[PDB]
Coordinates of C-alpha atoms and ligand atoms in Angstrom, one line a residue:
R5 CA 102.5 -51.1 226.0
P6 CA 103.2 -52.9 222.8
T7 CA 101.1 -55.3 220.7
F8 CA 101.9 -59.0 221.0
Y9 CA 101.7 -61.7 218.4
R10 CA 101.6 -65.5 218.8
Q11 CA 103.7 -68.2 217.3
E12 CA 104.1 -71.9 218.3
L13 CA 107.8 -72.6 218.8
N14 CA 109.7 -75.2 220.8
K15 CA 106.5 -77.1 221.5
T16 CA 105.1 -74.0 223.3
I17 CA 103.1 -70.9 222.6
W18 CA 105.4 -67.8 222.2
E19 CA 103.7 -64.5 222.9
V20 CA 106.1 -61.6 222.1
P21 CA 105.9 -57.9 221.1
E22 CA 105.9 -57.3 217.4
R23 CA 109.3 -55.6 217.6
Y24 CA 110.8 -59.1 217.8
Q25 CA 110.7 -60.8 214.4
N26 CA 112.3 -63.8 212.6
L27 CA 112.0 -66.0 215.6
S28 CA 114.1 -69.2 215.2
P29 CA 114.4 -71.8 217.9
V30 CA 118.0 -72.2 219.2
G31 CA 117.5 -74.8 222.0
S32 CA 115.4 -75.8 224.9
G33 CA 115.6 -77.5 228.3
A34 CA 113.7 -78.0 231.5
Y35 CA 114.6 -74.4 232.5
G36 CA 113.5 -72.6 229.3
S37 CA 113.6 -72.3 225.5
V38 CA 115.7 -69.9 223.5
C39 CA 115.0 -68.3 220.1
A40 CA 117.1 -66.0 217.9
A41 CA 115.2 -63.0 216.7
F42 CA 115.6 -59.6 215.1
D43 CA 114.6 -56.5 217.1
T44 CA 113.2 -54.1 214.6
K45 CA 113.2 -51.2 217.1
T46 CA 117.0 -51.4 217.6
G47 CA 118.1 -53.2 214.5
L48 CA 119.9 -55.8 216.6
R49 CA 120.0 -59.6 216.4
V50 CA 118.9 -60.8 219.9
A51 CA 118.2 -63.9 221.9
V52 CA 114.9 -64.4 223.6
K53 CA 114.4 -66.9 226.4
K54 CA 111.0 -68.0 227.6
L55 CA 111.3 -69.5 231.0
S56 CA 109.5 -72.9 231.2
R57 CA 106.8 -72.8 233.9
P58 CA 108.7 -70.4 236.1
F59 CA 106.1 -70.6 239.0
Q60 CA 105.3 -74.3 239.0
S61 CA 107.2 -74.9 242.3
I62 CA 108.7 -72.8 245.0
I63 CA 112.3 -73.4 243.8
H64 CA 111.3 -72.7 240.2
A65 CA 109.8 -69.4 241.2
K66 CA 112.8 -68.6 243.5
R67 CA 115.3 -69.3 240.7
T68 CA 113.2 -67.3 238.2
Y69 CA 113.5 -64.4 240.6
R70 CA 117.2 -65.3 241.2
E71 CA 118.0 -65.1 237.4
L72 CA 116.1 -61.8 236.8
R73 CA 117.7 -60.2 239.9
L74 CA 121.1 -61.4 238.9
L75 CA 120.8 -60.3 235.2
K76 CA 119.3 -56.9 236.1
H77 CA 122.5 -56.4 238.3
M78 CA 125.2 -57.4 235.8
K79 CA 126.9 -54.4 234.2
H80 CA 130.3 -55.7 232.9
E81 CA 131.8 -55.9 229.4
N82 CA 132.5 -59.6 229.8
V83 CA 129.2 -60.7 231.2
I84 CA 125.9 -61.0 229.3
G85 CA 123.5 -58.1 230.0
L86 CA 119.7 -57.8 229.8
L87 CA 118.3 -55.8 226.8
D88 CA 114.7 -56.4 227.7
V89 CA 112.3 -58.4 229.9
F90 CA 108.6 -58.7 229.2
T91 CA 105.4 -60.7 229.9
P92 CA 102.2 -60.8 227.9
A93 CA 100.2 -60.7 231.1
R94 CA 98.3 -57.5 231.8
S95 CA 98.2 -57.9 235.6
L96 CA 99.6 -60.0 238.3
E97 CA 96.5 -62.2 238.3
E98 CA 97.4 -63.6 234.9
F99 CA 101.2 -63.4 235.2
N100 CA 102.4 -66.8 234.1
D101 CA 105.3 -66.3 231.7
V102 CA 108.5 -64.4 231.7
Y103 CA 110.7 -63.6 228.7
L104 CA 114.3 -62.4 228.8
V105 CA 116.2 -60.7 225.9
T106 CA 120.0 -60.3 225.3
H107 CA 122.2 -59.6 222.4
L108 CA 122.7 -62.4 220.0
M109 CA 126.5 -63.0 219.5
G110 CA 127.9 -64.1 216.2
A111 CA 129.8 -67.1 217.7
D112 CA 130.8 -69.1 220.8
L113 CA 134.3 -70.3 221.8
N114 CA 133.6 -73.6 219.9
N115 CA 133.2 -71.7 216.6
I116 CA 136.1 -69.3 215.9
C119 CA 137.3 -64.9 215.1
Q120 CA 141.1 -65.5 215.2
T123 CA 148.1 -67.7 218.5
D124 CA 149.4 -67.4 222.1
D125 CA 148.3 -63.7 222.1
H126 CA 144.8 -64.8 221.1
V127 CA 144.6 -67.4 223.9
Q128 CA 145.8 -64.7 226.4
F129 CA 143.2 -62.3 225.3
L130 CA 140.3 -64.7 225.5
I131 CA 141.3 -66.2 228.8
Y132 CA 141.9 -62.8 230.2
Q133 CA 138.4 -61.7 229.3
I134 CA 136.9 -64.9 230.9
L135 CA 138.8 -64.2 234.1
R136 CA 137.9 -60.5 234.1
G137 CA 134.2 -61.5 233.9
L138 CA 134.6 -64.2 236.5
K139 CA 136.3 -61.7 238.9
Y140 CA 133.2 -59.5 238.6
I141 CA 130.7 -62.4 238.9
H142 CA 132.6 -63.9 241.9
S143 CA 132.7 -60.5 243.6
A144 CA 128.9 -60.5 243.5
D145 CA 129.1 -63.8 245.6
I146 CA 127.8 -65.8 242.6
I147 CA 129.3 -69.1 241.3
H148 CA 128.7 -69.9 237.7
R149 CA 129.1 -73.8 238.0
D150 CA 128.5 -74.5 234.3
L151 CA 131.3 -72.8 232.4
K152 CA 132.1 -74.4 229.0
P153 CA 132.9 -73.1 225.5
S154 CA 129.2 -72.9 224.5
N155 CA 128.5 -70.5 227.4
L156 CA 131.2 -68.1 226.2
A157 CA 130.0 -65.8 223.4
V158 CA 132.3 -63.8 221.2
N159 CA 131.5 -61.0 218.7
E160 CA 133.4 -60.0 215.6
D161 CA 136.2 -58.2 217.4
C162 CA 136.8 -61.1 219.7
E163 CA 135.1 -59.5 222.7
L164 CA 134.0 -62.3 225.0
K165 CA 130.9 -62.5 227.2
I166 CA 130.0 -65.1 229.9
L167 CA 126.4 -66.4 229.8
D168 CA 124.6 -69.5 231.1
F169 CA 122.6 -71.6 228.6
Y182 CA 127.3 -82.0 221.8
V183 CA 129.6 -80.2 224.2
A184 CA 129.2 -81.7 227.7
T185 CA 129.3 -79.6 230.8
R186 CA 131.0 -82.7 232.5
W187 CA 134.2 -82.2 230.4
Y188 CA 134.7 -78.9 232.2
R189 CA 133.2 -79.5 235.7
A190 CA 135.5 -79.3 238.8
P191 CA 136.4 -82.7 240.3
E192 CA 135.0 -81.9 243.7
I193 CA 131.6 -81.5 242.0
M194 CA 132.1 -84.8 240.3
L195 CA 133.0 -86.4 243.6
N196 CA 129.8 -85.2 245.2
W197 CA 131.4 -82.5 247.4
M198 CA 128.5 -80.3 248.6
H199 CA 130.6 -77.5 250.1
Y200 CA 132.6 -76.3 247.1
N201 CA 133.8 -72.7 246.6
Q202 CA 134.1 -70.3 243.7
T203 CA 137.3 -71.8 242.3
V204 CA 135.2 -74.6 240.8
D205 CA 134.8 -72.0 238.0
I206 CA 138.7 -71.8 237.8
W207 CA 138.9 -75.5 237.1
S208 CA 136.6 -74.9 234.1
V209 CA 138.8 -72.0 232.9
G210 CA 141.8 -74.2 233.0
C211 CA 140.1 -76.9 230.9
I212 CA 138.9 -74.2 228.5
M213 CA 142.4 -72.7 228.2
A214 CA 144.0 -76.1 227.6
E215 CA 141.6 -76.7 224.7
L216 CA 142.4 -73.3 223.2
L217 CA 146.1 -74.1 223.5
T218 CA 146.1 -77.6 222.0
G219 CA 143.0 -77.6 219.9
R220 CA 141.7 -80.7 221.7
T221 CA 139.3 -81.3 224.7
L222 CA 141.5 -81.8 227.8
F223 CA 139.2 -84.3 229.6
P224 CA 136.6 -85.6 227.0
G225 CA 135.1 -88.2 229.3
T226 CA 132.3 -90.3 227.9
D227 CA 130.7 -90.8 231.3
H228 CA 131.0 -89.9 235.0
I229 CA 133.6 -92.6 235.7
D230 CA 135.6 -92.0 232.5
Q231 CA 135.8 -88.3 233.4
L232 CA 137.3 -88.9 236.9
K233 CA 139.9 -91.3 235.5
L234 CA 141.0 -88.9 232.8
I235 CA 141.4 -86.2 235.4
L236 CA 143.4 -88.3 237.8
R237 CA 145.6 -89.5 234.9
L238 CA 146.8 -85.8 234.5
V239 CA 146.8 -84.4 238.0
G240 CA 147.6 -87.6 239.9
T241 CA 145.5 -89.6 242.4
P242 CA 144.9 -87.8 245.7
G243 CA 145.9 -89.1 249.1
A244 CA 143.4 -89.9 251.8
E245 CA 143.7 -86.5 253.5
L246 CA 143.1 -84.6 250.3
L247 CA 140.2 -87.0 249.5
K248 CA 138.3 -85.9 252.6
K249 CA 138.3 -82.2 251.4
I250 CA 136.9 -82.9 247.9
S251 CA 134.8 -86.1 248.0
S252 CA 131.8 -87.8 249.6
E253 CA 132.1 -91.2 251.3
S254 CA 131.2 -93.5 248.4
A255 CA 133.4 -91.5 246.0
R256 CA 136.3 -91.7 248.4
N257 CA 136.0 -95.5 248.6
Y258 CA 136.0 -95.8 244.9
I259 CA 139.0 -93.5 244.3
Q260 CA 140.9 -95.5 247.0
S261 CA 140.4 -98.7 245.0
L262 CA 142.3 -97.3 241.9
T263 CA 145.9 -97.9 241.1
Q264 CA 148.1 -95.0 242.1
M265 CA 148.7 -92.5 239.2
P266 CA 151.4 -89.9 239.5
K267 CA 151.0 -86.3 238.5
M268 CA 152.2 -85.5 235.0
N269 CA 154.5 -82.6 234.2
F270 CA 152.3 -80.2 232.4
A271 CA 155.2 -79.1 230.3
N272 CA 155.2 -82.5 228.5
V273 CA 151.4 -82.3 228.0
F274 CA 151.2 -78.8 226.6
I275 CA 154.4 -79.2 224.5
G276 CA 155.6 -76.0 223.0
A277 CA 153.1 -73.8 224.9
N278 CA 154.1 -70.5 226.5
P279 CA 155.8 -71.6 229.8
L280 CA 153.9 -68.9 231.7
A281 CA 150.6 -70.5 230.4
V282 CA 151.8 -73.9 231.6
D283 CA 152.6 -72.4 235.0
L284 CA 149.2 -70.8 235.2
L285 CA 147.5 -74.1 234.2
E286 CA 149.5 -75.9 237.0
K287 CA 147.8 -73.4 239.4
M288 CA 144.3 -73.9 238.0
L289 CA 144.2 -77.6 237.5
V290 CA 144.8 -78.8 241.0
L291 CA 142.4 -81.0 243.0
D292 CA 142.9 -79.1 246.3
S293 CA 140.3 -76.4 246.0
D294 CA 141.9 -74.6 248.9
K295 CA 145.1 -74.3 246.8
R296 CA 143.5 -73.4 243.5
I297 CA 144.1 -69.9 242.2
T298 CA 141.3 -67.4 242.3
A299 CA 140.1 -65.3 239.4
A300 CA 141.6 -62.1 240.8
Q301 CA 144.9 -63.9 241.5
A302 CA 145.0 -65.4 238.0
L303 CA 144.4 -62.0 236.4
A304 CA 147.6 -60.8 238.0
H305 CA 149.7 -63.7 236.7
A306 CA 152.6 -62.9 234.5
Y307 CA 150.9 -64.8 231.6
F308 CA 148.6 -61.8 231.2
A309 CA 151.2 -59.1 231.5
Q310 CA 150.3 -57.5 228.1
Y311 CA 146.6 -57.0 229.1
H312 CA 146.7 -56.8 233.0
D313 CA 145.2 -53.5 234.1
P314 CA 144.0 -53.5 237.8
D315 CA 142.2 -50.2 237.2
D316 CA 140.1 -51.8 234.4
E317 CA 139.2 -55.0 236.3
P318 CA 136.4 -53.9 238.5
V319 CA 134.3 -55.7 241.1
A320 CA 130.5 -55.6 241.2
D321 CA 128.4 -53.2 243.2
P322 CA 127.0 -55.0 246.3
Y323 CA 124.5 -57.6 245.3
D324 CA 121.7 -58.0 247.9
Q325 CA 121.1 -61.8 248.1
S326 CA 119.1 -61.7 251.4
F327 CA 116.2 -63.1 249.4
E328 CA 118.1 -66.4 249.4
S329 CA 117.2 -66.7 253.1
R330 CA 113.5 -65.8 252.7
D331 CA 111.0 -68.6 253.1
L332 CA 108.2 -67.6 250.7
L333 CA 105.4 -69.3 248.9
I334 CA 105.0 -69.6 245.1
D335 CA 102.7 -66.6 244.9
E336 CA 105.1 -64.5 246.9
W337 CA 108.1 -65.2 244.6
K338 CA 105.7 -64.7 241.7
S339 CA 104.8 -61.3 243.1
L340 CA 108.4 -60.2 243.6
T341 CA 109.3 -61.4 240.1
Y342 CA 106.4 -59.4 238.6
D343 CA 107.7 -56.2 240.3
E344 CA 111.2 -56.8 238.9
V345 CA 109.7 -57.2 235.4
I346 CA 107.6 -54.0 235.4
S347 CA 110.4 -51.9 237.0
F348 CA 113.0 -52.9 234.4
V349 CA 114.6 -50.0 232.4
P350 CA 116.5 -50.9 229.2
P351 CA 120.1 -49.7 228.7
Ligands
LIG401 C1 119.0 -69.7 238.1 C2 120.3 -68.9 237.7 C3 120.6 -68.5 236.4 N1 121.7 -67.8 236.5 C4 122.4 -67.2 235.5 C5 121.6 -67.0 234.4 C6 122.2 -66.4 233.3 N2 121.3 -66.1 232.1 C7 121.9 -65.9 230.8 O1 123.0 -66.0 230.5 C8 120.8 -65.6 229.7 C9 119.5 -65.3 230.0 C10 118.6 -65.0 229.0 C11 119.0 -65.0 227.7 C12 118.1 -64.7 226.5 C13 120.4 -65.3 227.4 N3 120.8 -65.2 226.0 C14 121.2 -66.5 225.4 N4 120.9 -67.7 225.9 C15 121.3 -68.8 225.3 C16 122.0 -68.7 224.1 C17 122.3 -67.4 223.6 C18 123.1 -67.3 222.4 C19 122.9 -68.1 221.4 C20 123.7 -67.9 220.3 C21 124.5 -66.8 220.2 N5 124.7 -66.0 221.2 C22 123.9 -66.2 222.4 N6 122.0 -66.4 224.2 C23 121.3 -65.6 228.4 C24 123.5 -66.0 233.3 C25 124.3 -66.2 234.5 C26 125.8 -65.8 234.5 F1 126.4 -66.1 235.6 F2 126.4 -66.4 233.5 F3 125.8 -64.4 234.3 C27 123.7 -66.9 235.5 C28 122.1 -67.9 237.8 N7 121.2 -68.6 238.5

């Protein structure tokens, strides 16, 4: 049981074991604050996240539990993994804060390591990690370049932490569809891969409405029947007021690109989420022929999400979270 020191960072009091030094605030939000640090015990650069009031509400406590459970379960080369989890509390009765620790990566996909081969390798790794995540019955929902970390040797890792999420969000989420499926993440991959191919953001909308119009300008406005699978009533009415836009031929948009990459993008960037390619299907596409290895593209061990159906109070989620903290074993 180590010694903690205190330091006021990100408008809050950080209490961390002395092994973590050189704390430097990275960013913050309503769901936590992140610092880069140096772990003197391993010699690693790490990221430390302090969850912001994790037990203020039932949903806060449940998602605190949800994140810790999820992260303790992820064992994949292309998904961020947990190096440590700690609390300064000495007992459940004073348990109020939770800290998570991962590797610090040298870069994200916005800031780059190294061609068509380099786009293939990066997108392959995203899809390899997504196949794993999706096999655990988890949807990322927030994929964007700043959530994709890359080390020196261009090994990529998916995480969840300017660069707007809206630029990469699936249209059915933008149109207020509540019942979307895992391929919302594939839409995001298509937008990311377009930007790696051309150098430019595919749909850099300045606002909610601008985003929809830029999307429809490329894929074409949907018919009424398609609208009812991807959109809520007020969004359907608005889309139906717009001039008809035809689908563009992606070959004239991604001029010069590998024709197999264009074919893959045509399968990713479709409005019909029942027609959109899955991560496992995309990994088998001929575009990735030089890296595709079904024996090295594993699924996840079964992930017990039955807690998602439990109706628990704040103190009950707090209690389960505490037990996940004190049972953690580092890799
Ligand atoms: C409520 C909820 C959360 N999630 C979920 C959480 C994470 N967490 C992290 O990635 C995470 C948690 C703690 C830490 C410390 C970090 N590390 C981190 N965070 C922000 C930035 C950086 C960073 C900064 C600079 C360079 N490299 C990394 N690292 C990640 C990851 C996923 C997924 F799907 F992507 F796997 C899902 C699901 N439901």
